[PDB]
Amino acid sequence: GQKVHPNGIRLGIVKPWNSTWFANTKEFADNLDSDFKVRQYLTKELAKASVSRIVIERPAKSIRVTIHTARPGIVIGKKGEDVEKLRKVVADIAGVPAQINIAEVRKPELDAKLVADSITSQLERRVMFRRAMKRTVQNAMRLGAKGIKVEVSGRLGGAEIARTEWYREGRVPLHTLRADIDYNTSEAHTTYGVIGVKVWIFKGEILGGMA
Amino acid sequence: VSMRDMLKAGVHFGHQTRYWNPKMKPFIFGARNKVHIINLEKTVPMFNEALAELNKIASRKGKILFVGTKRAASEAVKDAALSCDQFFVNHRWLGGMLTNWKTVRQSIKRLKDLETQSQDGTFDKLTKKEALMRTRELEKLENSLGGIKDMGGLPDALFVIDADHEHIAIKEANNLGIPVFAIVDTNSDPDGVDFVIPGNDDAIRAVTLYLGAVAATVREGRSQ
Amino acid sequence: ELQEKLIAVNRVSKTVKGGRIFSFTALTVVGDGNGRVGFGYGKAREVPAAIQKAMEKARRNMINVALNNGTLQHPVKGVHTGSRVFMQPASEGTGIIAGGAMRAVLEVAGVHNVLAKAYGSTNPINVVRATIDGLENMNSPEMVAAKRGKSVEEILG
RNA sequence: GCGGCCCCCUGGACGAAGACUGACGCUCAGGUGCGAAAGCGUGGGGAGCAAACAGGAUUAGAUACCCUGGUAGUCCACGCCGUAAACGAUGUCGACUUGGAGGUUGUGCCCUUGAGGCGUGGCUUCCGGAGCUAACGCGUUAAGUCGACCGCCUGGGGAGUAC
RNA sequence: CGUAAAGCGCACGCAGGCGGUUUGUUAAGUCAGAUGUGAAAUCCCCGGGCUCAACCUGGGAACUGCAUCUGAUACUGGCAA
Numbered sequence: 001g002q003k004v005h006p007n008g009i010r011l012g013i014v015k016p017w018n019s020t021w022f023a024n025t026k027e028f029a030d031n032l033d034s035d036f037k038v039r040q041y042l043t044k045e046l047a048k049a050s051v052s053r054i055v056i057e058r059p060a061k062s063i064r065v066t067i068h069t070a071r072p073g074i075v076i077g078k079k080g081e082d083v084e085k086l087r088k089v090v091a092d093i094a095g096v097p098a099q100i101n102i103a104e105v106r107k108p109e110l111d112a113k114l115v116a117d118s119i120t121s122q123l124e125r126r127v128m129f130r131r132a133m134k135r136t137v138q139n140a141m142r143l144g145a146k147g148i149k150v151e152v153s154g155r156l157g158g159a160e161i162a163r164t165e166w167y168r169e170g171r172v173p174l175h176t177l178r179a180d181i182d183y184n185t186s187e188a189h190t191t192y193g194v195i196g197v198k199v200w201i202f203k204g205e206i207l208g209g210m211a
Numbered sequence: 212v213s214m215r216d217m218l219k220a221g222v223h224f225g226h227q228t229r230y231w232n233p234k235m236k237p238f239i240f241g242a243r244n245k246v247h248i249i250n251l252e253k254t255v256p257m258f259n260e261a262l263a264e265l266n267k268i269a270s271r272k273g274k275i276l277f278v279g280t281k282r283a284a285s286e287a288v289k290d291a292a293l294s295c296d297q298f299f300v301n302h303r304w305l306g307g308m309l310t311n312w313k314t315v316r317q318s319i320k321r322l323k324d325l326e327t328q329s330q331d332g333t334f335d336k337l338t339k340k341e342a343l344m345r346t347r348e349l350e351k352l353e354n355s356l357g358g359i360k361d362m363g364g365l366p367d368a369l370f371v372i373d374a375d376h377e378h379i380a381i382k383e384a385n386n387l388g389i390p391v392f393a394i395v396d397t398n399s400d401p402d403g404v405d406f407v408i409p410g411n412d413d414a415i416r417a418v419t420l421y422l423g424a425v426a427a428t429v430r431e432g433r434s435q
Numbered sequence: 436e437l438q439e440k441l442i443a444v445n446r447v448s449k450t451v452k453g454g455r456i457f458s459f460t461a462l463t464v465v466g467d468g469n470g471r472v473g474f475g476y477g478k479a480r481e482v483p484a485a486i487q488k489a490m491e492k493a494r495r496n497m498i499n500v501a502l503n504n505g506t507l508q509h510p511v512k513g514v515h516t517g518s519r520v521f522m523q524p525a526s527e528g529t530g531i532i533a534g535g536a537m538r539a540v541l542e543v544a545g546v547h548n549v550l551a552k553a554y555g556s557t558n559p560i561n562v563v564r565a566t567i568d569g570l571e572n573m574n575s576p577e578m579v580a581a582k583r584g585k586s587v588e589e590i591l592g
Numbered sequence: 593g594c595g596g597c598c599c600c601c602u603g604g605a606c607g608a609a610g611a612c613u614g615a616c617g618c619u620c621a622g623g624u625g626c627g628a629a630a631g632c633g634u635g636g637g638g639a640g641c642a643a644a645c646a647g648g649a650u651u652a653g654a655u656a657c658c659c660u661g662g663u664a665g666u667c668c669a670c671g672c673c674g675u676a677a678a679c680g681a682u683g684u685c686g687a688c689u690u691g692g693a694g695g696u697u698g699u700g701c702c703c704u705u706g707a708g709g710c711g712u713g714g715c716u717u718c719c720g721g722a723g724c725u726a727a728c729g730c731g732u733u734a735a736g737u738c739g740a741c742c743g744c745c746u747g748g749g750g751a752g753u754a755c
Numbered sequence: 756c757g758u759a760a761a762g763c764g765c766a767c768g769c770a771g772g773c774g775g776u777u778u779g780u781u782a783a784g785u786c787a788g789a790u791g792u793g794a795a796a797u798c799c800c801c802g803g804g805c806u807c808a809a810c811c812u813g814g815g816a817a818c819u820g821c822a823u824c825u826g827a828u829a830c831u832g833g834c835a836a
């Protein structure tokens with residue numbers, strides 16, 4: 001049927017929030033709107049920088065943006081120039097001063113967003129959907145995912161009738177709340193429409209929780 | 212072992228005439244009161260030869276699997292097998308213990324994981340009810356695989372009680388070339404057994420006689 | 436090191452409430468090229484998985500054949516179901532003369548010079564079984580001398 | 593194919609112990625004979641049953657179906673016919689090969705014999721191993737292992753039809 | 756040749772096919788050897804000549820047969836017991 005968002009159901013249990021700040025009702029909406037604009041701009045500007053996660057915090061009258069990426073050197077540029085320009089424009093978008101930090105994701109093949117981006121890019125760049133998804137699971141299991149599942153959906157290969165197909169290796173318990181299931185999604189805009197790709201990666205359970 | 216020793220224990224009795232396998236004709240002395248009497252003249256020398264071969268196997272670091280799942284003799288088989296640093300199966304033989312050794316290995320890995328976890332800790336990271344549930348699972352697995360939990364690889368020989376009762380294990384052994392020594396009563400089929408010991412297979416006293424002889428010879432081979 | 440050859444791939448189907456479920460079967464043969472040959476047969480939803488199951492099965496269930504310098508010891512008949520196979524030793528230079536199913540088995544087995552022919556049903560799955568059985572029952576002069584309680588030349592010479 | 597009881601004539605089978613003949617045996621093209629039922633010819637007989645038939649409820653039609661009668665026939669004597677899922681869908685005969693539970697019919701020995709326990713034959717039913725088979729299955733009454741002779745088979749339809 | 760096409764409905768039985776075991780004899784079948792013959796060309800083997808090949812050609816093998824003679828006597832047949 002219809003399943004709950006894994007990250008959504010697990011938020012506060014074994015998953016952290018992407019945005020972490022306090023604000024009264026007078027400015028909560030404004031903060032959300034600024035967050036949306038900043039994330040949109042950064043995602044588009046760094047589309048080719050393998051950005052995995054944009055954590056926005058709002059210390060006092062400032063905004064700290066942490067970009068989890070698998071390619072820190074591209075984002076940074078020679079001696080910080082690119083970070084500087086990104087910060088200078090994020091400060092414009094937010095209004096308050098801004099600071100940018102870069103966190104490398106050591107093993108991108110275990111990152112759901114990066115896996116989805118790779119598969120989407122391949123599909124747009126004209127590759128066999130079965131080959132692409134099988135290659136990403138194999139790589140994920142090789143790098144050590146306790147489990148992985150990929151679901152491609154919609155007019156695969158230009159077929160007139162859209163179909164859904166999914167591969168799954170290992171174990172991906174989605175009803176276990178203490179399980180660590182990094183889930184993300186991507187859409188491939190191809191000449192015959194939108195192809196949706198969902199990726200779940202199970203990377204062990206958390207007992208102590210630690211939120 | 213002595214001919215008198217076996218006769219005293221009653222090795223010579225067998226099943227009824229109506230329930231017999233014709234292939235066991237050479238080892239049957241005759242019939243009295245519609246009950247078959249096994250030939251102990253066949254039993255004693257064959258048992259000695261089985262002891263000698265088992266001595267060689269045990270003397271070359273051989274792994275011996277004692278198998279008998281009769282409710283009468285399971286406890287005796289467990290104790291006798293443990294007395295000689297060997298391995299046993301005392302409850303219902305799982306089909307595929309040898310041919311599906313990969314899945315049995317998965318079960319052994321599960322057992323080791325569970326006890327390592329239950330002694331390192333993490334049960335304090337689990338609800339007391341989850342702790343009890345995992346303990347119950349560990350107990351069941353220990354009952355199922357306690358005798359072979361540390362066998363490590365494929366056994367080097369099988370000793371079997373009531374070949375008919377354990378024919379599945381004999382079939383896997385035949386497929387895998389593992390030599391089978393088996394106590395084969397008049398009603399059983401001796402074709403699948405490399406070393407058939409023709410004698411009673413029910414009486415606990417006779418079972419203990421066979422097992423004690425086997426364990427003594429195994430310890431002789433082990434001591435070196 | 437062992438050489439493996441896929442003889443035939445076939446698609447089967449099973450009918451269930453919703454409709455037809457398609458699967459595949461794979462027949463493969465592995466050999467050491469020096470008288471040891473095994474055959475395997477696997478099933479799976481997809482062809483590569485079926486072939487891999489077949490390879491794994493084929494590595495076990497293998498037997499030894501007492502070859503003689505790349506040719507057979509003596510003419511042999513094999514029989515399984517409706518597949519009756521006939522093989523005979525051949526002189527050097529002949530090569531492998533056989534139908535495809537027998538050709539693959541003999542090539543991976545290492546019989547360099549053999550004349551073969553299949554009679555009756557040429558169903559590959561049973562032709563392979565009958566060829567394997569025929570090659571298995573084929574004995575050697577040393578084994579027949581051992582059986583008969585004499586020496587080699589006492590049979591040969 | 594054979595079904596109350598009795599009598600007259602007659603065929604076949606099986607067992608026990610012996611005596612006798614001394615290869616006199618097996619198979620069989622053509623040929624001869626027997627061959628359910630329906631059917632035909634002659635003449636009887638004809639209770640019940642019953643093709644055909646007739647009637648009784650009966651729509652552009654009664655043919656159906658159900659009831660009421662009911663002839664041939666079914667029975668007998670003599671001829672003819674000569675076909676059937678005439679099936680165990682398994683040609684005849686001989687030899688070898690692990691068992692079990694029954695049935696039926698002889699016959700020997702032994703317990704104290706009646707009951708009962710040990711054998712030894714014939715025919716026969718059901719399970720089942722090896723083996724064989726495409727499988728199903730067959731399995732000492734083989735469809736196993738062989739031998740002798742005979743009868744057939746060669747895509748389906750046309751067709752067991754035409755001449 | 757149980758069910759895929761294929762065991763006559765069944766029995767007797769002439770011609771025909773086959774036939775238990777021992778001894779002798781026979782040399783019919785059978786085997787061995789030899790002789791004659793199996794035309795030449797063709798096929799095959801070793802060579803030779805056209806610049807090679809096709810082609811021509813030397814010698815041989817073969818032509819599995821038939822007939823006769825002398826031998827062998829296990830098996831089948833005849834005869835005798």
Ligand SMILES: [Mg+2]
Pocket residue numbers: 002003
């Ligand atoms: Mg819902």
Ligand SMILES: [Mg+2]
Pocket residue numbers: none
């Ligand atoms: Mg198999």
Ligand SMILES: [Mg+2]
Pocket residue numbers: 555556
């Ligand atoms: Mg064919």
Ligand SMILES: [Mg+2]
Pocket residue numbers: none
């Ligand atoms: Mg006739």
Ligand SMILES: [Mg+2]
Pocket residue numbers: none
């Ligand atoms: Mg009549």
Ligand SMILES: [Mg+2]
Pocket residue numbers: none
């Ligand atoms: Mg009449």
Ligand SMILES: [Mg+2]
Pocket residue numbers: 641
């Ligand atoms: Mg009437």
Ligand SMILES: [Mg+2]
Pocket residue numbers: none
């Ligand atoms: Mg009427």
Ligand SMILES: [Mg+2]
Pocket residue numbers: none
């Ligand atoms: Mg009349």
Ligand SMILES: [Mg+2]
Pocket residue numbers: none
């Ligand atoms: Mg007709």
Ligand SMILES: [Mg+2]
Pocket residue numbers: none
């Ligand atoms: Mg007819």
Ligand SMILES: [Mg+2]
Pocket residue numbers: none
């Ligand atoms: Mg009848």
Ligand SMILES: [Mg+2]
Pocket residue numbers: none
């Ligand atoms: Mg009948």
Ligand SMILES: [Mg+2]
Pocket residue numbers: none
């Ligand atoms: Mg018929």
Ligand SMILES: [Mg+2]
Pocket residue numbers: none
């Ligand atoms: Mg006759």
Ligand SMILES: [Mg+2]
Pocket residue numbers: 720731
């Ligand atoms: Mg049966």
